[PDB]
Design a protein around this ligand. Structure first.
Ligand SMILES: C=CC1=C(C)/C(=C/c2[nH]c(/C=C3N=C(/C=C4\NC(=O)C(C)=C4C=C)C(C)=C\3CCC(=O)O)c(CCC(=O)O)c2C)NC1=O
Length: 208
């Protein structure tokens, strides 16, 4: 059972071609394990990969997924970080994440964002970065907006039909995310340092 189930459903209802090609990890961890990690690789028409991490424990439920489109049409990735940290607190982030360094991407008609702790806005995050904070029982209030972002992304995929498989397009992007993403603290704590290292470098941001 996950509070993110309707977001997850919407994603795969939009892109039903994204089927599991590799289960990269199913790990136990946390307290004596109360933490579980599932890391899947999915592939399908017009995508290089969709890499999906889902970490659950008694207090938290994190769904971290990036759709890497096929290269050749200068399309952004679609990224999400849906984090429940406790019974009282969640953060929802999703965005069009463009692989070009210091390149402003936007989709006119979408909400526009407004500074954050860790990343650099406008650099692999778009003008339409969507970040909200709320209670777990409140997450579906933003589902319709998420569905609009999915609709726009499906439109760009369907209209451009990229076919390239040049993973080096994503090198700067995966390098930036590796450098800046605050995933290491949580991961080491629950799973150990070698597993943390592998998860970040060989699964999350492996195109460096
Ligand atoms: C798997 C483990 C995992 C951990 C431990 C994790 C932690 C994590 N991500 C964060 C922020 C964030 N995370 C993102 C975005 C992303 N980050 C990504 O890895 C991707 C793909 C995006 C795509 C949109 C952004 C923009 C913030 C800053 C939010 C903020 O400052 O409130 C924060 C700061 C939240 C805050 O203080 O408000 C933490 C602790 N995210 C995780 O996924």
């Amino acid at each position: 059972k996950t509070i993110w189930q309707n977001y997850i459903d919407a994603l795969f209802e939009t892109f039903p071609q994204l089927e599991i090609s590799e289960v990269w990890a199913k790990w136990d961890g946390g307290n004596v394990g109360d933490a579980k990690l599932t890391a899947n690789i999915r592939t399908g028409e017009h995508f290089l990969k969709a890499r999906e991490a889902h970490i659950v424990d008694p207090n938290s439920d994190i769904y971290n997924t990036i759709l890497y489109p096929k290269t050749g049409a200068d399309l952004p990735c679609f990224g999400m970080d849906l984090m429940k940290f406790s019974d009282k607190k969640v953060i929802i982030v999703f965005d069009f994440q463009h692989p070009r360094e210091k390149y402003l991407f936007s989709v006119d008609g979408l909400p526009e964002d407004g500074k954050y702790r860790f990343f650099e806005m406008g650099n692999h995050f778009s003008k339409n970065i969507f970040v909200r904070y709320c209670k777990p029982d409140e997450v579906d209030q933003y589902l319709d907006t998420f569905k609009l972002y999915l609709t726009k992304y499906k439109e760009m995929i369907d209209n451009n039909k990229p076919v390239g498989e040049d993973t080096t397009v994503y090198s700067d992007f995966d390098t930036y995310m590796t450098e800046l993403d605050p995933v290491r603290g949580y991961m080491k704590n629950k799973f150990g340092e070698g597993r943390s290292e592998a998860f970040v470098n060989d699964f999350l941001f492996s195109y460096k």
